[PDB]
Ligand binder design. Structure first.
Ligand SMILES: Nc1ncnc2c1ncn2[C@@H]1O[C@H](COP(=O)(O)OP(=O)(O)OP(=O)(O)O)[C@@H](O)[C@H]1O
Ligand SMILES: Nc1ncnc2c1ncn2[C@@H]1O[C@H](COP(=O)(O)OP(=O)(O)OP(=O)(O)O)[C@@H](O)[C@H]1O
Ligand SMILES: Nc1ncnc2c1ncn2[C@@H]1O[C@H](COP(=O)(O)OP(=O)(O)OP(=O)(O)O)[C@@H](O)[C@H]1O
Ligand SMILES: Nc1ncnc2c1ncn2[C@@H]1O[C@H](COP(=O)(O)OP(=O)(O)O)[C@@H](O)[C@H]1O
Lengths: 461, 297, 345, 318, 316
């Protein structure tokens, strides 16, 4: 041992003494698709709720602007063109491929909107399209108040922080995917025109390989390789093979590992293993943060070892029922829509001369507000004294709902049963699942609350 | 008008070494009221004269542009004009590196007298490219005398022990004790300054709270720890202040060296976690859990 | 105009129900000249915003309550909404994201340049109340201190936050620390009883104490729960079923699920619950705090220290990192490992 | 007057010291017309810029130097690559033949996009223009850019060769230096001539003479005796007395816990701890330094250093 | 003057690219068939991305390459006003080409392009697909926005394995008559780090300096903390021998290597070291945390000694 009881005879030293003074001494040292575009209204495909429900609004009930949502490839670009063709209307298109300065964004659309056609009077009507939106936006908001010809802005989320206040005057539709019962027939006709042969089963397989994308299907008469990585890591040097096999995008690999490592069945007593795996996931997160805060390319050589770490720990004899990662992205977009909805509610409330509370403070303390809104459900019949003293009751309650701009609207479910929903729908902002559910308000009571809200609006104005 | 500049007046030897240049870059650091800016301005007036003035200083782009427009300019005719850059301590590391670059490519005809609170300088200006000069703070007795004089000429009713406590809670500098005295006499209407008002102005936790924290830790029951930490957070006391006072108490009483060591390791890591933005309540609960484990031995 | 939480917010410093000594000190501060920059802090529901509004009421006129919405844009462009009055501007620059520096600079620049239009009859400055200063970035806070020291003579700043831990020391130096503690249980009982009296009601002391304890000394929670239990049952009862938010109940049930079984299946179920909590926009540190508070109720005394230390450790790593689910999930996994080993042995 | 760093900045190629391998290789490249793109990297103040400037000055005469050597600094402003650098590399000479030269000092300060653009520029015009990249961290240079050039590592300057240059400085300038003063100057330099000359400036100016106490007080670096006292108090005195002694010494001499910790780390390997004790001390001290770097209170971090040693006291004694 | 061996032995045909066999064969299929789609080329630097794209364009276009191909680098202007003014105008341009040929726009090093520039690129790519094709190139594929990857056949390049680098080094040595030893080849391969450009540059630099190719000369020319010293220090950390590991680390420090270089070589050696794989992962995570501290700015000898101590105590 290096510790000495007596000082060294001829060596430099320092002494260490204990809490008792014992002391010791240590030494110191020193093409096909556009060929088969919809020619007439009869070339459209069945089972489609998009093209069958927009011609109702497009005739000349008072909606001004249009918008888009839902999955891509559903013919949202060609529905407007073919509807214009069938009803006798013209088409316009715009992009971010050209210079969309805020000023030029005005004139690039004004010509499309407020002038007629220098042609025969039949072709005068026009249809307008704006694409790839996700100065000019504020101008769109200014123009959207009053307009003559509805326009389409290509997006896929009506709950946007900006386009939500535009869809309230817009007749946005349902966007169901095109079912392939007639995609196969269309492809058979295309192949006959192009001199190609394929059995219905082969054609159906080629159609379903690309999620029944009509564009890709027509281009087919001529995916994702991350499952390989997940299979190599989750079932059986090996680790050098997984290090080399992780050649690809890394964030989605990590998402798949995070989503799938708890669905394996190596052991029910592998809490130590999942703790190490979560340690490695946290290490990856910290690396992602640090390689950006202190920009360092050399610091991103470690993240490739996350799949290797999920090997060794979780590699087993098969049973790799691996699903695609969705939890992180689904949580991201759900939290984004919750943030948009809280922004909507707070814009309804916070600057209204009163309601002095932080939006975060309000969010954590709004369920009790809904519980005040509950009110006794005694089904008031009389025009006075609504089952209670009105002032300490429904009157003050409708006052506080008008404060938050909370109202009850009418909706009709596809089953046909009448339903009322709160106007900005703060319940699912506030309520949670799988805990004791409280009884809701009756239909007629919500109707009475809406009527009281309207008369309160009339009284305040 | 604040009492700071109202009364702003040892280190003339640095003025002598600056005048004896017939000159490097300068780095003046110390507590804020130690007269570093006054020292460099006096050295300026002595070394050039009243008719020649200097440059005193948004980010770093404007700093670099201003220094370029100022240094790349013919002088009256002494060879080296300077630029000050007070409050350099608040500069970020990238801003400090850009400033170091600006000191070069201009060192042929200009100098820089950085004024800072010490260790915040990155290694490039701190080591080489600067001549460091530390400005020691006034001793405690002189500080108490100066506070007494300020209280006299401002008719502030504060006791001598009140002045001592004011210096204690602002240890190592004026311009913080003075501001605390001004804020206290504003809050109390000047009529009377007690211990509690100074304690609240300074943000200090009362010693009764710290004694209760140690009593709860000694009690050995986690429920009492939760209650005392919850009360301390509810009172609004900063967790960094609790860490400082807890460390001051622990390091001086009669705990075992092992107990002191464990509690001080915990205090240091809690201070680091609080510096990183960790939750005050959780950090304090964990700290008090470690303290309870040590005291309830 | 109807909510109990807002119907009885005191209008002036002289009618505050608690921290009366601090209210008197604040009236003394506003009574003299050279009103300084205030850093009002304290836990949510302590009354910071109420005290700030009262401070304005004796500082400016009654027209400080005539609050009107405003919107402005910033040059980076990001649009931000504000709340202003004839004498003060109230803005939360945090919601502008990482562009909070430019928005704070622009707002204070504009208000200081606009106060000069013969607006000096009552006071010689315009108050710029910043809310949630602790949510600002370091660069934003440095811009804030620069603008504070630059336009001190024309505009005054009031900073409101729940904790001064995230406020940079330079800002704490230039401002006057106004600590507003959370009201005591007795103060909450007193204000609840006064609200009930002014409402023509009667509140048993047992129910007042129960509401005060359940509110965790948050006064807006106390008033909200009092009114909710009033509309649930007009005659109060000492054992009334006081309601509480479903995110607190969900957090408690999540901790119960963590306790009830320690397996990776339960880990994935708890991870789903953690998503449910997170996406509902409750802060991850609040999740960790409530989770630990309920988990300690289900722990032996020899386990509570380690559980609390793990909670602090993983909340710290959560603050360092960017994906809250990773560290929340790692904390839950570590706790189940510890609890499973302890209950097993 | 003009600082000695600028005044004694080398001009001829023979002034440079300890880089005889690098100098010989670069001069051989110059003579044989095989000069590649150069990447000179190392600690600050070891003579990379002076080396390349001397080579450029022997390549081009004074009147041809200003039109054939473009000197730029990456810290001054991507527009550099696409403007001056691209224009200079893409054009021929004015009044000479042969290649032009670009000296990009502080090349590590470029962004990765700028380094990619520079790689494209270097690749396109490699025949007419040679680039010399000067940087401190080779790790900051993207592997694509550093694969276009031959890397020369300018190491730290050893005392046995650093001493003669400072001897020339103290002979030419009227400086009175002691042997311990020279040794301390070398030690605080740690292979940095700019640092050594700046310390000599500050000491010989403020105190008039250069000696160990004088240089250490001027730079603020803790003495060997002070660090030995701190270690002795931590290992022997109890926690409260050790804390008082170290706090008093630190506030008296204005010592930084960074420097105290850096020197105690060295003493930890000097003195003969047990292996486990040394591992514990190294882990704890690395933690303390990391916690210092973020802006914590130095009182508490100092108490944690004292704690790290007080824990090992009893373990060592037994 | 002679061309550097990186340019002297630059592949001019897709047949002489020793890179990823699947992607190379796919590119040859594109060159043979003709109707190449829009392609994204991601991978490590020095793997053959730009060489492959230029060879593909040259094979496709023949003599029409000069007026049918628009090659943009990191040294060119590629802002929003280029993808909209230069790229669009070139796409609209009329070039007469054979039946299966298209105008090829090579946005080389496109990861440097901003989000706005690629958004401008999006349906400029989509519209003129009838007449022009876009061949992107980047090191990081996540730097290319979602629509571009959606409308491109993302080809992936991977680091050249040791054998591929060895074969190309043999070819270059034989064609240059360069003396060598197997240890020198192993040293060149180690310093290459999977880059053919780096391997060729290191070989040429060692030939220029010393002529002979052996490990001593290679590490004299390609100066880095020696893999043998770093390897034995890692071995000392495995045996929980802190003193010997610190002897090696302090020797490296006195030689003047920066902590960034030392930790980079520590990670490189520990990546392919002989350990239990769990212990290797523990070491990798600890080295990653220390490297995060180093990059954050906390770069001192004490940090590296603390890393050594943590590695030693990972093995208890
Ligand atoms: N109902 C339909 N009937 C016939 N053809 C259709 C129908 N819907 C889509 N198609 C065809 O599918 C192909 C792909 O559609 P397209 O590219 O226009 O998609 P999109 O949904 O408009 O796109 P996005 O949502 O991305 O803007 C086109 O050839 C189009 O004619
Ligand atoms: N070998 C040397 N001989 C003499 N002086 C030297 C030598 N190396 C460095 N110096 C001194 O270093 C100072 C400037 O350093 P220089 O720029 O030449 O080196 P460097 O290592 O490239 O620096 P940096 O990378 O920090 O810019 C001058 O004072 C010069 O005298
Ligand atoms: N597969 C390979 N076979 C032979 N040499 C190769 C190979 N890959 C790369 N090289 C060498 O690297 C040089 C350039 O490689 P590459 O095609 O990546 O060009 P680059 O412009 O350096 O690429 P980038 O900047 O996009 O990383 C080639 O000229 C050749 O010397
Ligand atoms: N004296 C008082 N009487 C009644 N309520 C009070 C009193 N003081 C504070 N409060 C309550 O405190 C709450 C506000 O405190 P705080 O959370 O700091 O700010 P915010 O208004 O942003 O929520 C209000 O709901 C108010 O009812």
């Amino acid at each position: 041992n290096p510790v000495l009881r007596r000082p060294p005879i001829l060596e430099d030293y320092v002494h260490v003494t204990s809490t008792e003074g014992v002391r010791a001494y240590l030494v110191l040292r020193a093409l096909w698709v556009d060929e088969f575009a919809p020619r007439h209204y009869t070339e459209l495909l069945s089972d489609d709720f998009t093209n069958r429900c927009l011609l109702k609004w497009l005739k000349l009930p008072k909606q001004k602007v249009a918008l888009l949502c839902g999955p891509p490839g559903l013919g949202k670009t060609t529905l407007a063109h073919v509807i214009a063709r069938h009803a006798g209307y013209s088409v316009v298109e715009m992009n971010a491929s050209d210079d969309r300065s805020p000023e030029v964004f005005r004139t690039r659309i004004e010509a499309a909107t407020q002038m007629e056609s220098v042609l025969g009077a039949g072709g005068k009507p026009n249809c307008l399209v704006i694409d790839e939106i996700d100065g000019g936006g504020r101008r769109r908001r200014a123009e959207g108040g009053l307009l003559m010809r509805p326009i389409i802005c290509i997006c896929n989320d009506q709950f946007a922080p900006s386009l939500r206040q535009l869809k309230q005057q817009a007749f946005l539709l349902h966007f169901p995917p095109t079912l392939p019962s007639r995609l196969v027939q269309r492809l058979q006709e295309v192949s006959l025109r192009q001199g190609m042969r394929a059995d219905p089963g082969v054609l159906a397989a080629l159609c379903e390989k690309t999620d029944n994308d009509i564009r890709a299907c027509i281009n087919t008469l001529q995916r994702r390789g991350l499952f390989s990585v997940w299979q190599e890591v989750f079932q059986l040097f090996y680790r050098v093979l997984h290090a080399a096999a992780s050649a690809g995008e890394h964030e989605k690999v990590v998402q798949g590992l995070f989503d799938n490592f708890l669905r394996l069945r190596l052991r029910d007593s592998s809490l130590g293993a999942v703790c190490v795996a979560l340690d490695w996931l946290a290490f990856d997160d910290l690396l992602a943060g640090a390689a950006h805060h202190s920009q360092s390319f050399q610091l991103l050589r470690y993240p490739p070892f996350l799949p290797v770490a999920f090997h060794v720990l979780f590699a087993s004899s098969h049973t790799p029922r691996i699903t695609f990662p969705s939890s992180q992205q689904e949580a991201q977009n759900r939290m984004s829509q919750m943030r948009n909805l809280i922004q909507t509610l707070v814009s309804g409330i916070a600057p209204a001369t009163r309601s002095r509370a932080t939006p975060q403070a309000l969010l954590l303390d709004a369920l009790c507000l809904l519980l005040d809104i509950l009110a006794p459900k005694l089904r008031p019949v009389s025009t006075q004294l609504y089952s209670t003293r009105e002032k300490q009751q429904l009157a003050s309650l409708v006052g506080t709902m008008l404060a938050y701009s909370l109202t009850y609207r009418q909706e009709r479910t596809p089953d046909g049963q009448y339903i009322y929903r709160l106007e900005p729908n703060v319940e699912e902002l506030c309520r949670f699942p799988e805990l004791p559910a409280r009884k809701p308000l009756t239909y007629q009571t919500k109707q009475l609350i809406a009527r009281e809200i309207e008369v309160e609006k009339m009284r305040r104005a | 008008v604040p009492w700071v500049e109202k009364y702003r007046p040892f280190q003339e030897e640095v003025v002598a070494v600056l005048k004896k240049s017939l000159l490097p870059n300068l780095l003046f650091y110390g507590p804020p009221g130690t007269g570093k800016t006054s020292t460099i301005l006096a050295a300026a007036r002595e070394l050039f004269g009243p008719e020649l003035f200097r440059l005193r200083v948004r980010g770093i782009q404007v700093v670099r542009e201003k220094v370029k427009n100022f240094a790349q300019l013919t002088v009256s005719g002494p060879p080296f004009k300077i630029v000050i850059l007070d409050e350099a301590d608040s500069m970020t590391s990238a801003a400090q590196a850009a400033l170091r670059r600006t000191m070069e490519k201009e060192s042929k005809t200009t100098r820089f007298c950085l004024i800072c609170n010490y260790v915040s300088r990155i290694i490039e200006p701190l080591t080489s490219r600067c001549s460091k000069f530390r400005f020691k703070p006034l001793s405690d007795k002189i500080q108490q005398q100066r506070l007494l004089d300020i209280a006299k000429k401002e008719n502030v009713k504060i006791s001598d022990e009140g002045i001592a406590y004011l210096v204690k809670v602002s240890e190592g500098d004026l311009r913080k004790a003075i501001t605390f005295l001004q804020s206290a006499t504003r809050l109390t209407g000047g009529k009377e300054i007690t211990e509690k008002v100074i304690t609240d102005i300074a943000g200090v936790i009362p010693a009764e709270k710290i004694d209760g924290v140690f009593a709860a830790c000694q009690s050995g029951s986690f429920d009492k720890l939760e209650a005392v930490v919850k009360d301390l957070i509810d009172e609004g006391h900063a967790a960094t202040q609790l860490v400082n006072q807890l460390h001051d108490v622990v390091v001086e009483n009669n705990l075992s060296d092992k107990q002191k060591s464990i509690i001080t390791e915990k205090l240091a890591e809690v201070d680091k976690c609080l510096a990183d933005g960790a939750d005050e309540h959780l950090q304090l609960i964990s700290l008090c859990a470690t303290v309870m484990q040590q005291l309830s031995q | 105009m109807s909510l109990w939480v807002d119907k009885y917010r005191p209008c002036s410093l002289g009618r505050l129900d608690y921290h009366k000594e601090q209210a008197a000190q604040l009236r003394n501060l506003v009574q003299c000249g050279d009103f300084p920059h205030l850093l009002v802090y304290g836990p949510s529901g302590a009354g910071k915003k109420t005290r700030i509004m009262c401070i304005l009421r004796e500082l400016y006129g009654v027209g400080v309550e005539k609050l009107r919405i405003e919107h402005q844009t910033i040059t980076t462009k990001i649009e931000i909404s504000t709340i202003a009055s004839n004498y003060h501007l109230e803005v939360n620059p945090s919601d502008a994201g990482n562009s909070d520096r430019v928005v704070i600079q622009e707002m204070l620049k504009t208000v200081a340049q606009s106060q000069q239009l013969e607006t000096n009859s009552q006071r010689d400055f315009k108050v710029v109340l910043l809310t949630e200063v602790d949510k600002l970035t370091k660069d934003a806070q440095h811009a804030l201190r620069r603008t504070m020291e630059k336009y001190m003579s024309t505009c005054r700043l009031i900073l409101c936050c729940n904790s001064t831990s995230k406020v940079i020391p330079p800002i704490r130096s230039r401002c006057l620390a106004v600590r507003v503690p959370a009201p005591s249980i007795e103060d909450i009982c007193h204000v609840l009883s006064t609200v009930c009296k002014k409402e023509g009601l009667n509140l048993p002391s047992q129910l007042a104490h129960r509401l005060a304890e359940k509110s965790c000394r948050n006064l807006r929670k106390a008033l909200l729960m009092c009114e909710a239990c009033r509309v649930q049952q007009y005659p109060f009862t000492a054992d009334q079923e006081i309601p509480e938010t479903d995110w607190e109940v969900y957090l408690r049930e999540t901790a119960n699920a963590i306790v009830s079984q320690q397996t990776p299946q339960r880990l994935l179920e708890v991870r789903g619950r953690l998503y449910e909590l997170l996406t509902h926009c409750i802060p991850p540190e609040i999740i960790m705090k409530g989770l630990l508070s309920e988990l300690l109720h289900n722990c032996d005394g020899q386990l509570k220290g380690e559980v609390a230390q793990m909670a602090a450790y993983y909340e710290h790593r959560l603050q360092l990192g960017s994906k809250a689910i990773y560290h929340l999930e790692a904390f839950v996994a570590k706790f189940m490992a510890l609890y499973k080993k302890f209950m097993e042995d | 007057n003009l600082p000695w760093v600028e005044k004694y900045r080398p001009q001829t190629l023979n002034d440079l010291i300890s880089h005889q391998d690098i100098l010989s290789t670069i001069q051989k490249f110059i003579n044989e017309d095989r000069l590649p793109h150069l990447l000179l990297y190392g600690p600050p103040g070891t003579g990379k810029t002076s080396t390349i400037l001397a080579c450029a000055k022997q390549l081009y005469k004074d009147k041809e130097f200003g039109s054939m050597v473009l000197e730029l600094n990456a810290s001054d402003d991507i527009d550099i690559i696409r403007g001056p650098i691209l224009s200079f590399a893409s054009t021929r000479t004015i009044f000479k033949k042969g290649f032009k030269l670009v000296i990009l000092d502080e090349a590590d300060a470029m962004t990765q996009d700028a380094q990619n653009a520079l790689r494209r520029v270097i690749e396109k015009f490699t025949e007419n223009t040679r680039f010399c990249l000067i940087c401190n961290y080779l790790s900051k240079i993207i592997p694509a850019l550093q694969s276009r050039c031959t890397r020369f590592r300018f190491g730290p300057l050893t005392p046995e060769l650093m001493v003669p240059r400072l001897e020339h400085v103290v002979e030419e300038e009227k400086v009175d230096i002691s042997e311990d003063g020279m040794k301390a100057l070398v030690t605080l330099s740690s292979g940095d001539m700019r640092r050594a000359l700046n310390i000599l400036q500050s000491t010989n100016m403020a105190f008039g003479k250069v000696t160990e106490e004088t240089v250490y007080t001027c730079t603020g670096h803790p003495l060997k005796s002070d660090i030995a006292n701190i270690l002795d108090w931590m290992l022997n005195q109890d926690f409260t007395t050790a804390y008082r002694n170290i706090t008093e010494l630190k506030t008296l001499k204005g010592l930084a816990l960074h420097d105290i910790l850096t020197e105690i780390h060295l003493f930890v390997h000097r003195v003969d701890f047990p292996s486990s004790v040394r591992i514990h001390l190294l882990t704890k001290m690395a933690d303390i330094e990391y916690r210092l770097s973020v802006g914590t209170n130095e009182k508490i971090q100092l108490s944690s250093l004292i704690a790290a040693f007080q824990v090992t006291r009893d373990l060592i004694v037994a | 003057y002679e061309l550097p061996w990186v340019e002297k032995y630059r592949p001019v045909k897709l047949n002489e690219i020793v890179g990823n066999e699947d992607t190379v064969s796919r590119l040859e299929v594109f060159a043979r068939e003709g109707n190449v789609p829009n392609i994204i080329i991601a991978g490590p630097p020095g793997t053959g991305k730009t060489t492959s794209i230029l060879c593909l364009a040259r094979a496709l276009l023949g003599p029409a390459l000069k007026d049918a191909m628009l090659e943009l680098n990191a040294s060119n202007d590629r802002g929003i006003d280029v993808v909209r003014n230069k790229i669009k105008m070139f796409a609209q341009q009329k070039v007469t080409l054979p039946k299966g040929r298209h105008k090829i726009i090579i946005l080389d090093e496109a990861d440097s392009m901003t989000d706005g520039a690629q958004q401008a690129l999006r349906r400029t790519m989509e519209i003129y697909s009838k007449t022009t094709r876009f061949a992107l190139a980047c090191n990081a594929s996540d730097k290319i926005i979602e629509p571009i990857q959606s409308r491109c056949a993302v080809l992936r390049y991977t680091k050249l394995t040791d054998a591929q680098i060895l074969t190309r080094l043999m070819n270059v040595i034989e064609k240059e008559r360069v003396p060598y030893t197997d240890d020198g080849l192993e040293a060149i391969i180690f310093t290459a780090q999977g880059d053919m450009r780096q391997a060729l540059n290191n070989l040429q630099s060692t030939f220029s300096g010393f002529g002979f190719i052996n490990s001593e000369n290679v590490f004299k020319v390609c100066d880095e903390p020696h893999p043998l010293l770093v390897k034995e220090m890692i071995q000392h950390c495995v045996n929980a021998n802190i003193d010997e590991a610190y002897k090696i680390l302090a020797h490296l420090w006195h030689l003047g290597y920066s902590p960034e270089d030392i930790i980079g070589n520590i990670f490189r050696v520990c990546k392919t070291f002989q350990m239990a794989e769990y212990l290797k992962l523990e070491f990798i995570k600890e080295i990653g945390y220390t490297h995060m501290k180093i990059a954050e700015g906390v770069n001192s000898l004490l940090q590296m000694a603390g890393l050594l101590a943590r590695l030693c105590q990972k093995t208890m």
